[model samples]
Target chain A: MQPFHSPEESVNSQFYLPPPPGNDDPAFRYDKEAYFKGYAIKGSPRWKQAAEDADISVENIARIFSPVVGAKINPKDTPETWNMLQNLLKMGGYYATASAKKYYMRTRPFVLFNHSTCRPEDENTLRKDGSYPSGHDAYSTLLALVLSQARPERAQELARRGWEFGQSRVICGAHWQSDVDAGRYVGAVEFARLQTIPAFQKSLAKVREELNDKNNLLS
Target chain B: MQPFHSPEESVNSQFYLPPPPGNDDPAFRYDKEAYFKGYAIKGSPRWKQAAEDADISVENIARIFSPVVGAKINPKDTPETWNMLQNLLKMGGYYATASAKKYYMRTRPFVLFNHSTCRPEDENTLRKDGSYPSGHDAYSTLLALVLSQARPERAQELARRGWEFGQSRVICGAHWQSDVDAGRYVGAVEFARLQTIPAFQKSLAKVREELNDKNNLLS
Candidate 1:
């Protein structure tokens, strides 16, 4: 009888999978090994607690973060504005990632973990250093934080979502827990920066009036 | 005795100087036309009226679209969140341009009107058929609308800014008043599409809360 080959085993046997080689090139190695490792470990406890402590009662968390998830807004609202908002968030994340890549010059976990085949979608992007600040984490956290701030009543729930978003990066193995945490932290800082802009302040006020009028009309 | 030419005469003579006749290919012919006559008719009363009329009050439009704009509730309040929202508005405008460019494939007015010696910057962007839907107009209108919805008190002012932004395109001779008007109309439709997304709704909510909290606390 032929031995059963599991998918993992079959792939292992079929491909020449070698561990990533350590680079002696000083230029390539930027992050302190211990520091990066510590950050990854912190996410475990910090995020778990954050998730556990999250307030689920805040329906607004889910409402704002994922408005399309359940209910629908009125047709009078324009998607062009929302689309622009989403793109701006995405661009902000891109800029954050670029900034981290330039600032930290940290190598990816796969490289640190010595994995042979780790192909991030854009090879050109992956080639750059600074994996400490995960773009996914930054973007997700920023969005989550902003939503939470907008609806403070839903703060706990928003935090939970942010935690989950950060965790996803770890699950994907694209980043260690530390990278997620740092990204989230930095994202929050960036979010604060955005608040100071006059345009942002004005937009927020407009949205409030619109919402108030909408609720009044509905009631 | 040879008569000395005045500077105006010199410029006029230079203006009529033809491109080497051999260079009169179909592609180059339009360049000549653009160089000489493109902006000649730009300041017509009809064009000015159209531009002004297209300058609908961003605040009023925002008020009209308010309910849709304020559907979600972001719990996390931070600058990053606001940045993301702004980015989303900008992105909507960008997509409008991409979509219009793909759909209309209209030649740029400058290319159609000017002579062959178009500036390098204009020359580069002139050939992209997407000139019909001005990104500037779409974005400017979208931003103004969002600002108006988010900040009703500043609606007229914001709308003026948005209109000015669109007018800049006309001044640059890249688009006609008709193109700007069409872009604004299309942008509104596109913005509506974006608003339906869960992510956008959440962002709006988050932004609104922050604005309210800040205003309440500060004011």
Candidate 2:
């Protein structure tokens, strides 16, 4: 599928540079400390939750938010909403963090600590990817914002899940807390930018209309 | 002394709602746990830094960024830049958090823990304020963004300081991590809104021009 916008046109994410890691600068210190803090919670329920969030499959992401929206977010159940969500997650995840990730090329926490992450299978590919401004965090956060806009009644819960999805990356030892933090901002930036795009707005309208249907909601 | 906009005009902050505290929502859980984490660092240098940030004095805020900008950010020496900084801090700190603060009315960490904060003098006033979106964090983050724009040469360092300024609130036992997190978004929202106001554009222009003067930015 084609992206909504190219990396060059992503001016919102372009200028944003996450603070560097491995430094005494308070911001960097927070990132380093939070990594260890995450280590302390290893094997706990919270750690398991992080592991759940570490799975970036479209199905898992949808299922993760089913409870928040008070309905199953299966593609088979709500095709219109699902397609729109998939497009958004794909676009934001692909387009939003490319520049910053490449620019910083910061090391992943698991790699830095010589430890394994929640998703061990992904480590081989994850090792090659830069760890600043997490792509998963951006897309998940963007999805949360979109769902919140569509389902205002459950906005707070959706917001919570979106935030936690990113924080999960930190706890899973895949990314630093700062990367997750900046990822949320990057997601919002993309959502804001998408609002200005006519085609994107059209899809958003369709999803909103689809969501209004009682049959689609499965309550 | 006059605000650039009213709370209604500050629609950016008006629409935003942070996740509530004392909840199982992953976001809220992070905030609650981060507060305990903050309590554990009470007497360290990081805690002292948070204590310093707890002072919302105009002079102190200005001084906080001086090192980042590599010069004296003083009123007597740089009146135009100083006045602009003060106005921005005053406006953002006062105006940005009113609506959300009133809406959430979340208790402060110090209040929740029945503990004394770094600035004991402000407790009476602080007790009445909502802890959802931190005003001090908002203004300081706003100050950091403004300085980052003015001193593009030091944009990354300025970004670091701005981010740390908000994180400090969590460290100082005043705000939940989510509150400080939302505060940065509020600050950015205000900055984005300020770009649209004609008067604000004029002020921003003057500050940019003033910053170009080597005398205003004394080594």
Candidate 3:
């Protein structure tokens, strides 16, 4: 498992990327929050009543992975590579988690522990639909993996950061230790798959070139 | 509701003429095996897991509606219309389901059900985060409503078919009866909203013309 910082710190430090240019089209800008909220509670009295009867437990859910390498990242690393790697890892992580969730279909612990506080987005909706493969773990591991790969010298630190990221999920009490374990396996497979893609290879080359060029310029 | 024989029977029947030449695409190439497989598991585990986990019941699932006026239709009222309607209903159902799923963030039944035998294809993916409304019922009802309006004579059949289609989820032992019921209600509301759109109105006219030409040629 990868090690990382506390969930509170990560959440506090979370940054929202600017919406892609031209995303201001009102047609695409949906009220996701309202839509989600409405869907959660749109069913019959029985379903909602049942949900009210359930219980949820909140606990630490984060895990972090320590890095493998220990080399300091060259000062020459470009922001573009960092951003590209981050995006790739994030997307891959999302897909991996999604795929696993469908396959495992685990139930959420919160619903089982404390029903009243479950606050399901919809009352009509059931508490058991999809609950495997932690999204947080996937994202955290991907980020840590990419960072560790880019900076071998700080591999242990980067891995530690990743572990902490998984730990956050536990802290949130959203997943079980098994979920985290399965997620790690899936995330690693997806990351490796990304590495094998030609586009990724090309991007890696370009980033390495940029780093070298920056170093030369500095020298 | 609209009369539909098996694919083979539909293919052989002379009710409708094929689409104009040069309209086929690689994506549409009918993979006989895949088609048969897809048909067999039309409402299998993969499909039901999402629906059932959302706690959608058979009663709430959307019912197809047939129109009683000059509604648009496909040529010869063949299986194409039936299939299209089915897809439309499912899509609408998905919208409701997705909304509910995300809102409630419910765990899937496969996680809870000890005897889960859902299809591999119907497994949940990240793209399907919401589960409040059943997509199957929504799309099924939408198609039924649109086709019924287009061909009012088939309203009873369409509605009946829609109900059965929604009920299939329960038969599959995936969704609760409530999920299906709520799905139907939400689907109806959504269909009503679609009716207000000019694009929908224009599409109806265009579809009618296409159907008319085909019907004339076939007759």
Candidate 4:
């Protein structure tokens, strides 16, 4: 897989471009507050879904790709591509939103609204992170872009899932609606920028080959 | 600027691409969950903004250009382009979400949560409408793109205001985050597509002239 960094040192948002508006801004806060007020209560089905999404396990995201790429691809099955997906998704979080998050230093949804977010267990850690421009949203969309292109026939479904990954963060009460929105754009732009790096391109080619496999199509 | 229809029948989401996943679907249900749970309460500032955003009145938006184009554009002063914007924004709703909204028929967050939305007065009526793709978001982003280009001197501010117009909906609890996010993409694509029409091109040139008028950039 293409290695942008050792997963420790990665791309910096400051060095990249104009950062998205800070989440602490009044306009941003106003919206977040309103979203919380208007949507505090929900149904059983939703609680179940948010609980599921609260976990950032790779299995969750990889499952979304199954619609386009087939069920549970293994490292041993299509060695290069699955490894590439793993590397990109795993390492992208370290760099993609680092600059923006640290700069915004926005409080989490639960903290700001005084409401409990989904998966209560994750709250303490999430509370410390910036709630603007979600990182999980960024990584999944980045992977979705590469995977969608791997199988163009399922492009729209792939695109929809990629976009929804960002939406899921909001559903979990972990981020603001704006955070997920910007998250996807950040993901899309970063994905585009990554195409320039030779290592990323090489890994992408390997994944592309696997996705284009004859068996990748719907049965 | 471009007249896709005679103004009676204009744009349709169905004419575009495969629909975004139904907002009512279970996976989709989760997104709604996290958003409401994450956001949960509000105050005066958000209420003030929601009260303001409840309506998509032209005057409500024209003031955003006060820093550049002047407070509330008098269509008579900048005759040509203003009228064109009027036609596009006013009529865009009829054809824009007609199909998709009907297809999705999403329930309002306020109704589901059993709370009041931005314009409590309008909630009774609004609760009946689909919530996945916001009409106001589409039209505002549509105008923001045009207006920002019109006044490059105040480009960032103009662009920011336009986008926030949609964000206001989220704050008001009028639409979902996914709805607003999709709202912008739909607006952008439609805007780009509008540029291709000859009639739209003519109106654009006229607006270009108006925007370029040394007096037009900043009054």
Docking class of 3: incorrect
lDDT of 1 by residue, A17-111 (tens): 11121345211232234224334554466534433322222232333444422222232552322432453354345554454445556676656
Best by lDDT: 2
Evaluate candidate 4 and give its CAPRI docking class based on DockQ. Answer: incorrect
lDDT scores in order:
0.43, 0.71, 0.40, 0.60
**B101-202, model 3: which lDDT tens digit per residue?**
445553333333433423433544522443333455555555555654554333445544555565455444344333444455444434434433345555
Candidate 2 lDDT, B4-89, residue by residue in tens? 65655553454545356456454565666677877888888888888888887768867777777776767776666677777776
Off by over 4 Å in 4: A5-30, A33-43, A215-219, B1-180, B183-219
Q: Give the TM-score, chain B only, in order for the candidates.
A: 0.54, 0.91, 0.54, 0.78
Model 4, B1-219: lDDT tens per residue?
Answer: 444555323344544434554555433554465346424545667657766865766665555544544433657657766676676675454445556678877676677777777577777778778875777777776676566445444444554465566557776776776677677655544453454356765676677677667665543
Of the two candidates 3 and 4, the one with more favorable DockQ, higher being better, is: 4
Model 2, A1-219: lDDT tens per residue? Answer: 345556654533435554554564445666766788788988999988888889888788777877777665666767767787678776778777887787778898888779988879888989999888888888887787777666656654665566567668888998887788787666655665564456776676767666766766644
After superposition, candidate 2 runs with Cα above 4 Å error = A12-14, B1-127, B130-132, B136-179, B185-219
Lowest lDDT sum, 10 consecutive residues, model 2 chain A, at: A9-18
State the TM-score for model 3. Answer: 0.31
DockQ of each: 0.01, 0.08, 0.02, 0.05
Please rank every candidate by DockQ, starting with the best: 2, 4, 3, 1
Query: lDDT of candidate 1 vs native?
Result: 0.43
- For model 3, residues A1-219, the per-residue Cα lDDT tens digits are 111211221110011111111224221122222223323553546334333322211111111121123221332345445444445444544555554455546665455455332244532333544545555555555545554344433434554444544433433334544355345433433343344345655665655455345342231
Worst 10 residues of 2 chain B by lDDT: B10-19
lDDT of 4: 0.60
**Which runs in model 3 stand beyond 4 Å of their true positions?**
A1-219, B1-91, B94-97, B126-130, B210-219
